[PDB]
Write a protein that binds this ligand. Sequence first.
Ligand code: ATP
Ligand code: ATP
Ligand code: MG
Ligand code: MG
Ligand code: MG
Ligand code: MG
Lengths: 355, 355
Amino acid sequence: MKQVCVLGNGQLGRMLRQAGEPLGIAVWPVGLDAEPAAVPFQQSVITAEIERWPETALTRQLARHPAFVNRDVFPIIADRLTQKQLFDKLHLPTAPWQLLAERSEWPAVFDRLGELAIVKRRTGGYDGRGQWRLRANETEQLPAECYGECIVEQGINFSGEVSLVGARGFDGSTVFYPLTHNLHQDGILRTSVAFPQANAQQQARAEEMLSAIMQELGYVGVMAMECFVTPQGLLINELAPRVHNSGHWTQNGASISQFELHLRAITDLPLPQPVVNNPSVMINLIGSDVNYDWLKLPLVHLHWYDKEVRPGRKVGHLNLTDSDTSRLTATLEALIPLLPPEYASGVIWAQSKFG
Amino acid sequence: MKQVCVLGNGQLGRMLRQAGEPLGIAVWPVGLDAEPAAVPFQQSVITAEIERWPETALTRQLARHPAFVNRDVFPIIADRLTQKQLFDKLHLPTAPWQLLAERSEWPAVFDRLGELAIVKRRTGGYDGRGQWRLRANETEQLPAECYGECIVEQGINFSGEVSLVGARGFDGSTVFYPLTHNLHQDGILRTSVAFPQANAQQQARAEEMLSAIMQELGYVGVMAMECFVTPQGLLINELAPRVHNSGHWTQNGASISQFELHLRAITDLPLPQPVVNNPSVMINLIGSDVNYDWLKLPLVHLHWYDKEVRPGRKVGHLNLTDSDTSRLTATLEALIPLLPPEYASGVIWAQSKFG
Ligand SMILES: Nc1ncnc2c1ncn2[C@@H]1O[C@H](COP(=O)(O)OP(=O)(O)OP(=O)(O)O)[C@@H](O)[C@H]1O
Ligand SMILES: Nc1ncnc2c1ncn2[C@@H]1O[C@H](COP(=O)(O)OP(=O)(O)OP(=O)(O)O)[C@@H](O)[C@H]1O
Ligand SMILES: [Mg+2]
Ligand SMILES: [Mg+2]
Ligand SMILES: [Mg+2]
Ligand SMILES: [Mg+2]
């Protein structure tokens, strides 16, 4: 019975453990502060749900582990500069950008990028923290700390956002789910909607890009590529070297979930193409307490994280899938009065995807 | 918040625990020999995946425990003599029978029940162990121990077997799954097939019968009723006061699984009718080692129990569901060479359901 250890103690690891169980794979999520002595890392394949970390007794032990899959890929992706350079190397479309070295460069930056600059911390950002959207007369708001520690990109006016989640096997095979439509508000993902068949052109463009990246990196497991939809085609925004929030719908809307797919990849099990026959919606639960009334609606799949509820925190997600989009829209409509007000916008945006 | 302890350490408990996690319900399977001092009985709803048990430090604590849902139904069900009588008291069709008290009753038993008698141990039987099929000149095979400890009933020539899995809530509401077709060989269930819409007359007869049963008992949770199909309609074979093997398909083929439904009922959560839109097939894994090649087929959902593989032991099950029956048939066909010989019969029988 394969053993896998996942570095990091969040919901991602928990979902990987839940997926592993019925497949006969024991998965052990280990936080950074864990005691290595307690960790069966020796008899396990190591994976992670994080991409960067401080040095601890646990991480020092891991360091010397032969089977930490993708170990060397993380730092490249963990630093936005190196990630952006990777797209450049591979000729992949992405927002024009540059390292933002010091105050003095501002003039050349706007000259280069346009009216709106999007400044991003090279490492550690998530949910939009560590991101600034500045105009020529607003540069003084950027913390000095940021000089040398941030990249700056052109503000992209996309018509929508989509991510491609897929996986690469140790033998180079790759498999993908259809593109997923993502809605972000205030920097955090709120809702995702996936259809069995995406714009065929967009789907091929994305697969070619993701494929080139996984190959170049020699990556094994699941990776998510977030892109921006523009009239010239997609632009890659960023990558996540792991299972990703946008693909949670796969737990209930694909024959093989992103969690199962990642475990198959890393343990070298078969990686056939997951079957996706119907559309799916996923609503993220953020800073809200669980309301079991949601369970009155039979299509709603509750995925609760057993995390402390605090503002802005991802606490769970709700998935719904059905071959009849009317049912989905109706389920959505019934959910509105059962969710806090800030959820209406995303729920309605999901409904409109079927309109 | 949800804390449930389940009496019994088998795969059913494990599947209840996997189901409860994402719902935010912490499920603790407790074996009979467990140390009561290590169990959260005081802060939980108690359920069980077994129906009769010896007195141990652990079960002693469960006697009369107010949090143990259905505690008094178990014993009624656990004895076939009491179970049969229930049917009788509710005018529900069942096989003509009687308590088999002693050797001398034999000639009259055959005069009354006809050619073939089915002897069954009053308690503890499963997978056909404790059952004997006898003609009038074979009674000497029945161990002497049986007299007074087994019932005897009419061998029924049924055209097929179907089970009804459903639940009853604390307020009397009930919900059910469509009937499932079950195939038993050598006393053990090998395969099940469910269709979204079952014979209407049949489904209604089953629901009326099971509702009468659960209501009569004040039962809360999931119960399964195995029946035999005959030209006068269904005959009830036996009941399982819990989630049941023939309902495993609901893990992937219904919007709410029988595991989830049981936890909903017992925790007083909502109990809407689960959605079932496509057919499902479940192949029981018995005494065989896991074969990861099964995973090359994308529709296959592996549910491995993490049990030691021994002859005749249920080690797992494979579920498959899709709206396209031709897909299911093709997946079944591909499964044959990937399973031991003894599985062909069952797989073919499933395929035949779609023929
Ligand atoms: N150049 C850009 N132009 C316009 N919008 C942008 C741009 N970069 C980011 N955004 C918007 O901000 C959202 C969050 O940005 P991004 O993914 O870089 O940050 P993050 O902190 O890494 O978020 P996370 O890791 O949680 O996805 C994007 O999905 C998009 O809505
Ligand atoms: N009276 C009967 N007539 C004909 N066949 C019968 C009869 N009783 C049982 N059988 C056959 O034997 C099977 C198993 O019998 P039964 O369910 O009573 O046994 P069990 O040991 O309680 O099995 P389990 O608890 O594992 O379902 C039935 O599903 C059916 O195939
Ligand atoms: Mg990011
Ligand atoms: Mg992002
Ligand atoms: Mg039985
Ligand atoms: Mg039975």
